[PDB]
């Protein structure tokens, strides 16, 4: 049975870079695929979608739009302490947080700092 942790890498693997908002992305589609048992239609669908010729990219936004605990959901809430712990690449996707943000719409999380500030991450 794949792990959230074993997901995360296979996903990893396939990104340029580090730490940028699509790593976030691998984070979040993990993290709430466990908390919902569906780590294996997840992996099939970012195997499916790599298998027709899309970017890793693209396969992971087809994900947020095909694997129906993503469809209409709202972005998870990130509680952190400083705009220091997020990701160096992820600095400039931050945005104010719109009214009702969804994540098969591009908000990826959102970052709650402990003074009070919230930015959501927008791919
Ligand atoms: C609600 C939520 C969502 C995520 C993706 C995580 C991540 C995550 C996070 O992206 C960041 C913390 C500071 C800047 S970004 C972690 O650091 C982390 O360990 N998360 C995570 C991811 C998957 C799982 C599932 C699992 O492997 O059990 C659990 C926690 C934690 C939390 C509490």
Redo the contacts with the bound molecule.
Sequence with gaps: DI???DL?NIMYDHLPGFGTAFH?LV??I???G??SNSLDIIHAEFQASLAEGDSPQCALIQITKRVPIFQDAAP?????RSRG???RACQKSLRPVPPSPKIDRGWV?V?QLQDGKTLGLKI
């Design positions: 792990s959230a942790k995360r976030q984070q979040v993990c993290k709430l466990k908390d998870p809430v990130i509680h952190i712990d997020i990701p999380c970052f």
